DNA sequence: CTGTATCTT
DNA sequence: AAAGATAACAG
């Protein structure tokens, strides 16, 4: 029991003796010496802790974490109660409930409840320096999630890749188009929902594109 | 009014 | 690479 789920490790610990991940943990472990890191050690893999890896069938891309005082914990745009939706949050929850009838804004800000049913939280980047937002990036990160999509598009049939923002977005290559479907639109933050977030309607299109591959789909409001 | 990306140089 | 411009709205 630890910080990797156990599929997951099964599937990525190949990636543990590679020199670009010895220098990424070396990094950040540097980093939490000298600054406070989002998120805490034992809640960066939190994304591997929700479902077996075999049964994703949906993953939303983000850019990085929440880098607001305990916000991240390891699934992307989730907070754990009592922390209050951030903005990004709120406005999914807004883009939500005109894109799904019977969503209603759950109250909270955990997503524990998507990850449960094979919907991968991820950020293209997975640390960040306090109030320093993508602070992390191009120290290792994108190589390591490079590796997770690429086992899921190598490994997996018929899934949904969600692109929210410019950084997850360039994960767009390793992905068979053909294969998978991949959907791309702008960050759900405020600075950028208006950039077509808000309308995209992301939810009802993976659940459509989830039935026609035989798939059971999504509840987002199981939260 | 301040804090929450994206494009350009 | 890093920073300026630009932008849109809830707390």
Redesign the pocket.
Known sequence: MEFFGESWKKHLSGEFGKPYFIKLMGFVAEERKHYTVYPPPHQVFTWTQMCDIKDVKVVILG?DP???PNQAHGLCFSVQRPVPP???L?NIYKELSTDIEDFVHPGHGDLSGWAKQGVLLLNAVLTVRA?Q??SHK?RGWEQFTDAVVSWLNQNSNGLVFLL??????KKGSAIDRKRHHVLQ???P???????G?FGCRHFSKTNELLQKSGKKPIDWKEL
């Open positions: 850019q929440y880098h607001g951030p903005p990004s709120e109030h937002a993508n191009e929210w923002g410019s950084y997850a977005q639109t702008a960050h933050s405020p600075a950028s929902v208006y950039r977030f």
